[PDB]
Amino acid sequence: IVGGYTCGANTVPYQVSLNSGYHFCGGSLINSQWVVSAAHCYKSGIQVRLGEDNINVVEGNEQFISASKSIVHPSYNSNTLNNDIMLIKLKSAASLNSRVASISLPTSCASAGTQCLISGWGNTKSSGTSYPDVLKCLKAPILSDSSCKSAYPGQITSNMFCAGYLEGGKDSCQGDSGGPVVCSGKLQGIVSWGSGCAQKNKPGVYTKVCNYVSWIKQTIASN
Ligand SMILES: [Ca+2]
């Protein structure tokens, strides 16, 4: 997250870190057995880390649980990142408590101008690199689909939206991928892609979760 603030420990209790020896992507806990992330985060060997603030220090609220199954969206296209969503089932149920909690799925899509909370452990610099240990947060509005499509001509689909600031300075960045965009208490987006970080006229692009709620609910009920 560039241009954000330190969330504070366990203030985003649905935020997960996906770990394969190291943090590599965020995700969101949607019930005690299932995490939502980005399909471009797919890999074998995932351990889901719940209850994290500093990802390099064991602070007392963590739960580390291996993934038992990953399910990339049937229509994920890695060239275009259309349908950039994946489900991860935990080998054992998380213990839900205040520090570890699920986030609700949308019942309908969110509108342009709605403010959302984006979080993660990605890079905090817009030119160089600096990776935080503690979780970072950013408040950002959903942008109009026309400004999104104007920023990235030929690349935005109906399964994507942009959020952030066309003037630059505030955005998601490398390492935030897969993490949550929560608006009015619902998981509306997943950190998906962009061009650079926090650059002018290049806002972040996010998977539009509301289009996937039926697939999510059917998939978890059958798995
Ligand atoms: Ca920790």
Domains of the chain: 1-12+103-210 (2.40.10.10), 13-102+211-223 (2.40.10.10)
Whole-number Å distance, alpha carbon 50 to ligand 1 midpoint, is: 9
For residue 49, how far is its CA from the centre of ligand 1 (angstroms)?
Answer: 9
Rounded to an integer, what distance in angstroms lies between the CA atom of residue 1 and that of residue 43?
Answer: 23
17, 157, 159, 165, 210 from 146: Cα distances, Å: 32, 11, 14, 14, 19
What is the C-alpha separation between 67 and 89, in angstroms, rounded? 6
Q: Tell me the C-alpha to C-alpha distance, in Å, between residue 37 and each of 73, 125, 171, 177, 202.
A: 11, 23, 18, 8, 22
The rounded distance, in Å, linking the Cα atoms of 156 and 149 is 6
The CA–CA distances, whole Å, from 219 to 20, 156, 211 equal 24, 26, 14
Are residues 52 and 17 in contact, defined by beta-carbon separation less than 8 angstroms? Answer: yes
- Residue tagged 């999510």 (tokens): 216
Give the Cα separation of 182 and 59 in Å (integer): 25
What are 161's two structure tokens?
A: 């939206």
Taking the CA of residue 215 as centre, how many other CA atoms within 13 Å lie in the half-sphere pointing to its CB? 16
Cα–Cα distances (Å) from 179 to 86, 149, 151, 165, in that order, read 11, 22, 22, 19
Q: Which of 17, 102, 177, 192 is catalytic?
A: 177
176 is catalytic: no
Is 53 considered catalytic here? Answer: no
| Burial of residue 127, with CB atoms counted within 10 A of its CB: 0-12 exposed, 13-18 middle, 19 or more buried | exposed
**Residue 39, token pair as written in the block:** 């399909």
84 backbone dihedrals φ, ψ, rounded to 5°: -85, 80
Q: Whole-angstrom Cα distance, residue 62 to residue 99?
A: 8
Where does residue 170 rank: exposed (0-12), middle (13-18), buried (19+ CB within 10 A)? buried
Token pair of 185 as six digits:
């208490």
Distances (CA, A) of 114 to 68, 84, 184, 189, 194: 35, 22, 8, 12, 20
Listed in sequence order, the residues at least 6 apart from 184 whose beta carbon sits closer than 8 Å to its beta carbon are: 110, 114
Binding residues for substrate are: 171-172, 174-175, 177
62 CB neighbour count, 10 Å cutoff: 17
What are the binding residues? 52, 54, 57, 62, 171-172, 174-175, 177
Our separate counts of H helices and E strands in the chain read 2, 13
Left (φ > 0), alpha (ψ -120 to 50) or beta: where does 184 sit?
left
Solving technique: X-ray
Cα 93 to its chain centre, rounded Å, is 21
Residue 140: which of 204, 53, 56, 71 has the closest Cα?
Answer: 204
Is 84 catalytic? The answer is yes
Closest CA to 109 of 38, 14, 205, 208: 208
Q: What is the bridge-based pairing of β-strands 160-163 and 180-183? A: unpaired
| Residue 172 CA, ligand 1 centroid: distance in Å | 21
Marked catalytic residue, from 17, 23, 53, 84: 84
Q: Which two tokens stand for residue 37?
A: 């992330």
Nearest to 33 by CA among 108, 99, 88, 78: 88
CA 131 to CA 104: how far, in whole Å?
28
* Bind-site residues for Ca(2+): 52, 54, 57, 62
